[PDB]
A paper describes a structure:
Interestingly, it contains an extra four-residue insertion in the W-loop, distinct from all known LMWPTPs.
VvWzb crystallized in the space group P212121, with two protein molecules in one asymmetric unit. The two molecules formed a dimer in the crystal, with an interface area of about 900 Å2. However, this seems to be a crystallographic dimer, since VvWzb existed as a monomer in solution, indicated by gel filtration. VvWzb adopts a typical LMWPTP α/β fold. Like other LMWPTPs, the active site crevice of free VvWzb is composed of the P-loop (residues Cys9−Ser16), D-loop (residues Lys115−Gln123), and W-loop (residues Ile37−Lys47). Compared with the D-loop wall, which is relatively orthogonal to the P-loop bottom, the W-loop wall seems to be laid flat. In the absence of ligand, the supposed phosphate-binding site is occupied by a chloride ion and a few water molecules; they interact with the P- and D-loop residues via extensive hydrogen bonding.
Author numbering: -1 to 146
The structure:
């Protein structure tokens, strides 16, 4: 009914949380187009980095494919192509507003339907941190799927 067909999942690096969230939500909603971007996307010179090796490993154990990901920079042009934008932290909303002020009105929280929780960043931590990040992303995505 809302027409949220193209969904953009956003974090800072676009290598841990947002590619995980993108692929978990994509598996739950096969007829939707789910992509991801970073407020300060991690790049190798100018090439988009793949998802963190541990993020790929943890998702693989939960039957979610996070291979063939290339990080991309969040821009106003990119935001204009999506119907719904889902940030990983409430704090990300201020930075997103500076890049894409026209995206105000379609920027929502990834963990909105799980008590408005921020998804913990597992970057540079052990496998267990990647497990907890995945588990909370899964709970949040399942709650979004019932509303989409
Ligand atoms: Cl991040």
């Amino acid at each position: 009914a809302m027409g949220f067909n193209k969904i953009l999942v956003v974090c800072v690096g676009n290598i841990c949380r947002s590619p995980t969230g993108e692929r978990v939500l994509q598996k739950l909603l096969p007829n939707k187009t789910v992509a991801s971007a970073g407020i300060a996307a991690e790049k190798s010179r100018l090439i988009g980095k793949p998802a963190d090796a541990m993020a790929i490993e943890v998702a693989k154990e939960n039957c979610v494919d996070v291979e063939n990901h290339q990080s991309q920079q969040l821009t106003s042009a990119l935001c204009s192509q999506y119907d719904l934008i889902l940030v990983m932290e409430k704090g990300h909303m201020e930075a997103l507003t500076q890049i894409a002020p026209e995206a105000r009105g379609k920027t929502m929280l990834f963990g909105q339907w799980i008590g408005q929780k921020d998804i913990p960043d597992p970057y540079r931590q052990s496998k267990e941190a990647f497990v907890h990040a995945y588990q909370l992303i899964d709970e949040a995505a399942q709650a979004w799927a019932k509303k989409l």
